[PDB]
Every structure is written in structure tokens, then in C-alpha cells.
Design a protein around this ligand. Structure first.
Ligand SMILES: Nc1nc2c(ncn2[C@@H]2O[C@H](COP(=O)(O)OP(=O)(O)OP(=O)(O)O)[C@@H](O)[C@H]2O)c(=O)[nH]1
Ligand SMILES: O=C(O)C(=O)CS(=O)(=O)O
Ligand SMILES: [Mn+2]
Ligand SMILES: [Mn+2]
Ligand code: NA
Length: 618
């Protein structure tokens, strides 16, 4: 782009560029970079090229500065340990800015919205000016050009993330497609503007914990959809700092999707092939910490079935001209929870994460490997553990060796079951959509919606045990992620039924988490969930394998393959109690009335009425 006009030499940052050229950038990309460099005052500007030489130089830089350690047991794997105040995506510090609040959340009838957190433009201006001026002093501003989706896909969109964290650059190279080829594809096109700072200008005003810069008291993750901007300050972690993932590919993208006729969803995508050589793609929305990654990478127990992974967390979907709902994974890697990952629960993740992977907040073994609760693989006599708090650790310490939200960040092209169409620009045709969460009582293993409207209500009605327990509402697994008013999002989903030629997927709801009276899981889950997927497959083919109930279709007796599982308390796992469901519909009704209020579509109110009526006839 061109040099800004100057009476002095205070606006052109060319002398501080240590990789790339401001003159090579598209005009509007130059203006974004240089305007924010003026505000944030970085010492240098590094324009990322996405090369393997860059990446290795970056990793070396962080290793020299003690920001990450090499895991010498594996091939090109690394470990970062954070400040314990900065360990997760933080919804209480996450906002969306629009002129009118109702564009962002429905105005609730009686209570405070739980469907988003609106901030006015003027309050955001104050917050921005209290944070960003001078915030990169003494640091490098990295410029990360990235594509969400295969480079060129009709469904793909480009962002530019400015950050002062080399951890963010390395993680974005895995999680997105990053570098010079993205700038060449973008040209003078539109892009999402992503600004990120850890909020710790040098010299440091406050103590640095574990070599991990953050500013918990000023953390703020903001989204300005009308300006196509995402501005995040004070956290270096996950969905707060890797701005392509939740901030772009769910919050900004769900609003662009509403504007443009598509969907952006917190869904895995998988391909499943049966023993008769037929393959189908499924999408599934479960809340965080409710097993999407385990399902997306399943190793099925049933012989002759195969599952392949297209993505594990975000889906972008659009009807094509033929009426098929086509989906892409806009991500380029998996940002998976590490604890609980074992050969029993996710053997294909175990395979994937031993090369080219960055781990955050797991334990390190003395021979340079990784450990966490639930890994279920013993260490040789002699090998010791350093916990994620950087302290010698043993099991008699009561605290976990890994933080419960610790992650791996691994390339998708390495997974041994990555689907052969996972980067197809046309996307994959979705034939079923699965909702679900953690329900210890009342909700059976699987049911099928009665109609598309009923299915949209079942997404709306989702609830899940918080991870005393509380049963939270998390409609469509999107509660922390709606880019705009949920009522309008329901209308958008309902409207897909009115598109001529639309081939609507079947909608299901699952529950892996039902417990008996003693608190034991009724269903063994994991790869045995292949039995539930086989039933859903047959359903999509029209098999006569369902029985009607008040909450939807369930498997007929004998319809699930439970060979090898004769031991299961089938009475309890599939049972439907009038008393539980009368209470459930009352909670659903109270939630939708308060939280969606004047923006609740008629058709969702009608499905609530019909479910109440069907339960009343039990
Ligand atoms: N009982 C049971 N637990 C399951 C099953 N599948 C996954 N889990 C549990 O789900 C958790 C793992 O899910 P996460 O990786 O946290 O879930 P996610 O949906 O991928 O979350 P995000 O990556 O945060 O969006 C662990 O507690 C697992 O034991 C299943 O079939 N049965
Ligand atoms: O919280 C989630 O749903 C996640 O996938 C982790 S993060 O990307 O939000 O950090
Ligand atoms: Mn996951
Ligand atoms: Mn997620
Ligand atoms: Na650290």
C-alpha cells in the first residue's frame, strides 16, 4: 500500500518492518496494520509468510525466551505453561457492540440476557482507549494473513490478525491456513480485521507469571460486526486470542451467515461409511466439554463401519443450488481438550498429536513427553512428572497434573482418519444433525425429531450439566457464541424449510451421559456410540426402525445393535417419565419466554405447545 502523507516521519512504519514489506500489502491491509501500529506502538512489525523457516525461527525464539519448551520425546512438539489466571476462553469478558442492543440479544421479558453480552459503542470506545494506546511498546506486532476454509473455497473468508504474541502466531499457523498465499488470494477484497494484544507493554508494570504475558483485570474480547472487526485485549489463551476460531468463525460469521443465507455453527462434521459401502456426513452440536472431539474422531467398535473426520468444532454450511446442505470445516487443525484423551476415549487423537503439535497446560514427563489426568497409560519406573504449574508432581498431591482445560493444537492433515473431502471447496453434504449435552436424568440415549420445526425446537431446548450441579441452557451449543439476536437465529434456521428444493437433514438428539440411581453411566459411550450412529444411518435411509414417543422417535425394541452389550440397563437408558418431562417442558417454556420473548418465532412456541400436549396424554 502507499506511504501515508507526513509532515515528519511518524506514520510510515516501513523502518520497523523485520519481515515483509508494507508496500507489498493491499492498500486496506496496509492501512489496518499501520494505523494499529500507530496506536499500539510496537517496536517491530513482522509480516508472516507461513513458511516452515519462519515457523522454526519463531519456535526457536520462544524457546530462547522461555515462553515454550520442546517436548523432546516427540517430533517437533512443544509445551506452553500459562499464568493460572489465563487458562480458558472467558465469557464474562466477551461482548458484541452494535448500535441497538436488540440486534445482539433479544430483550428479555424479566431477566438479564444469557444469550450474549451487549456493549454500547460509547462504552466500547472508553474501554478501547483505556487499553490499546501504547500496549505493544517494546514488542513485535505480527501480521497474520489467514483463510478460514480452503484457500479459494466459495465458503471461505479471509482475516488479518495483528498480535503481539508469538504463541498466537504459531497456534494460528496450525489452526488456520496462514501466510503469503492468503495475501495473494485476498488482493483488494474484504477481510475481517482482528486486533489482539496480551496487554503488557514493556517495561512490565506487573509481575510476569510463568513467562506468560496477560492482563486479567483488563481482559476484554470484543466484536464489532458492522465494522467487521474483532478486538481482544489481555488474554493469550485459546478462544480469546486465536481470533479465527470462536470470534471470527462463530460470532462474526454467524451474523454474516444470517445476512447471506448460510450457517456458522459449533458442530463437528464427520463422514461415516457402513458395511454396504454407503457413506453419509453428519454434523453434531454439543457444548464445550461434552465430547464433540471424541465423536468426530471416533474409532467405531462395530465391524465394517468407518468414521472419518472433517472437523471437530466449527462448521460453515450452505444450501447449494441443488438443495443439499453442504458443510466445510473452516479450521485447519484441532484445538482439543487434552485431559481424558486416552486409547479408550480417543485413540485417533493419540496418534495425531505426537508430531508438529503444541500443548498448553499439560504435565511434562522427565523424558520429554506429555501427561494428564485420564491418559490411562503408565510411565516406566523412574520417569517423573512436572505439573502444569511448573512444580514436581505425584498422584498424592491432590491437584491435577494438567489444567482441566489444557489443550493440544494439532494439524488436521495428520489425523489418520482425516476425511478425503475435508478440504474440498464445495463442502460435504450433511444428511443428519445431532444435538446433545450432559443430562444425568430423564433424557434417553437417542431420539429423532418429528419435523424440521420440531428439530429446531430440540436445538433450542438443549440443556447440559455445568462442567452441586446445575442444568444450564445451551441452545444449539451456541450460548457463548451467538453473533446476533437468538430469536432471529431461530427464524433463520426455521426459514431453511421454505427454500425450494432444500434437502433438509434429519435431526437427532443424543445423551451419552444418563446415569442410574447410583451415579453410574448407563451407556459405555466412546466407540460404542457407533451403535447409535448405525441407527441414525438407517433412519436417514428410511429404515422402519423407530417407535413414536412424546418426545420424538426412538429406536424400536431390538433396533439397536447391542450385541456384546446385553449387560446394559436398557429399561433405564431408554425410559421416558411423564413427571420428568412435565418439569422439562415447564423449564423450557420459562427459558424461552424470558430469554427470547418478543423475538421467539411462532413455530417454536407451537412446538413447545405440542410437546406439552403430547406429554399431557401420557
Ligand atoms: N460418558 C461419556 N463421556 C464422554 C463421551 N464422549 C466424550 N465424553 C466426555 O467428554 C469430555 C471430553 O469432551 P471435550 O473434548 O471436552 O469436548 P468438546 O465438545 O470437544 O469441547 P470443545 O473442544 O471445548 O468445544 C470428557 O469428559 C469425556 O470423558 C461418551 O461417549 N461418554
Ligand atoms: O470452549 C470451546 O468450545 C472451545 O472449543 C475452546 S476455545 O477455542 O474457546 O478456547
Ligand atoms: Mn473439542
Ligand atoms: Mn468448541
Ligand atoms: Na510459561
Amino acid at each position: 500500500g502507499s506511504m501515508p502523507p507526513q509532515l515528519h516521519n511518524g506514520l510510515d512504519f516501513s523502518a520497523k518492518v523485520i519481515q515483509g514489506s508494507l508496500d507489498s500489502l493491499p492498500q486496506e491491509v496496509r492501512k489496518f496494520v499501520e494505523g494499529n501500529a500507530q496506536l499500539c506502538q510496537p517496536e517491530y512489525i513482522h509480516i508472516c509468510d507461513g513458511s516452515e523457516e519462519e515457523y522454526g525461527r519463531l519456535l526457536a525464539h520462544m524457546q530462547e525466551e522461555g515462553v515454550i519448551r520442546k517436548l523432546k520425546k516427540y517430533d517437533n512438539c512443544w509445551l506452553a505453561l500459562t499464568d493460572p489466571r489465563d487458562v480458558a476462553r472467558i465469557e464474562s469478558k466477551t461482548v458484541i457492540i452494535t448500535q441497538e442492543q436488540r440486534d445482539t440479544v433479544p430483550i428479555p421479558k424479566s431477566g438479564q440476557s444469557q444469550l450474549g453480552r451487549w456493549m454500547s459503542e460509547e462504552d466500547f470506545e472508553k474501554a478501547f482507549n483505556a487499553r490499546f494506546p501504547g500496549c505493544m511498546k517494546g514488542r513485535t506486532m505480527y501480521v497474520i494473513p489467514f483463510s478460514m476454509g480452503p484457500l479459494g473455497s466459495p465458503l471461505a473468508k479471509i482475516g488479518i490478525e495483528l498480535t503481539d504474541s508469538p504463541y498466537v502466531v504459531a497456534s494460528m499457523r496450525i489452526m488456520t491456513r496462514m501466510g503469503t498465499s492468503v495475501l495473494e488470494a485476498l488482493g483488494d477484497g474484504e477481510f475481517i480485521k482482528c486486533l489482539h494484544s496480551v496487554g503488557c507493554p514493556l517495561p512490565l508494570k506487573k509481575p510476569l507469571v510463568n513467562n506468560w504475558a496477560c492482563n486479567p483485570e483488563l481482559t476484554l474480547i470484543a466484536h464489532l460486526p458492522d465494522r467487521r472487526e474483532i478486538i481482544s485485549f489481555g488474554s493469550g489463551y485459546g478462544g480469546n486470542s486465536l481470533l479465527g476460531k470462536k470470534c471470527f468463525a462463530l460470532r462474526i460469521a454467524s451474523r454474516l451467515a444470517k445476512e447471506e443465507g448460510w450457517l456458522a455453527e459449533h458442530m463437528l462434521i464427520l463422514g461415516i461409511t457402513n458395511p454396504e459401502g454407503k457413506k453419509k456426513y453428519l454434523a453434531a452440536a454439543f457444548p464445550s466439554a461434552c465430547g464433540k472431539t471424541n465423536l468426530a474422531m471416533m474409532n467405531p467398535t462395530l465391524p465394517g463401519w468407518k468414521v472419518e473426520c472433517v472437523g471437530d468444532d466449527i462448521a460453515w454450511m450452505k444450501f447449494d443450488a441443488q438443495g443439499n446442505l453442504r458443510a466445510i470445516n473452516p479450521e485447519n487443525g484441532f484445538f482439543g481438550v487434552a485431559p481424558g484423551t486416552s486409547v479408550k476415549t480417543n485413540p485417533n487423537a493419540i496418534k495425531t498429536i505426537q508430531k508438529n503439535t503444541i500443548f498448553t497446560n499439560v504435565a511434562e514427563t522427565s523424558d520429554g513427553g506429555v501427561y494428564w489426568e485420564g491418559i490411562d497409560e503408565p510411565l516406566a519406573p523412574g520417569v517423573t512428572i512436572t505439573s502444569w504449574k511448573n512444580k514436581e508432581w505425584r498422584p498424592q498431591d491432590e491437584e491435577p497434573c494438567a489444567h482441566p482445560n489444557s489443550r493440544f493444537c494439532t494439524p488436521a492433515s495428520q489425523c489418520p482418519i482425516i476425511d478425503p473431502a475435508w478440504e474440498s471447496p464445495e463442502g460435504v453434504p450433511i444428511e443428519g444433525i445431532i444435538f446433545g449435552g450432559r443430562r444425568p436424568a430423564g433424557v434417553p440415549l437417542v431420539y429423532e425429531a418429528l419435523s424440521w420445526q420440531h428439530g429446531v425446537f430440540v436445538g433450542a431446548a438443549m440443556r447440559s450439566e455445568a462442567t452441586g450441579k446445575v442444568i444450564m441452557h445451551d441452545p444449539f451449543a451456541m450460548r457463548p457464541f451467538f453473533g446476533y439476536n437468538f430469536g432471529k437465529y431461530l427464524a433463520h434456521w426455521l426459514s431453511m424449510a421454505h427454500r425450494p428444493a432444500a434437502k433438509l437433514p434429519k435431526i437427532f438428539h443424543v445423551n451419552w451421559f444418563r446415569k442410574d440411581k447410583n451415579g453410574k453411566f448407563l451407556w459405555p459411550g466412546f466407540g460404542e456410540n457407533s451403535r447409535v450412529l448405525e441407527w441414525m444411518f438407517g433412519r436417514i435411509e428410511g429404515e422402519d426402525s423407530a417407535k413414536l414417543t412424546p418426545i420424538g422417535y426412538v429406536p424400536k425394541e431390538d433396533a439397536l445393535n447391542l450385541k456384546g452389550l446385553g449387560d446394559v440397563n436398557v429399561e433405564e437408558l431408554f425410559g421416558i417419565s411423564k413427571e420428568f418431562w412435565e418439569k422439562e417442558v415447564e423449564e423450557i417454556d420459562k427459558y424461552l419466554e424470558d430469554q427470547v420473548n418478543a423475538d421467539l418465532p411462532y413455530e417454536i412456541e407451537r412446538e413447545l405447545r405440542a410437546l406439552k400436549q403430547r406429554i399431557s396424554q401420557m
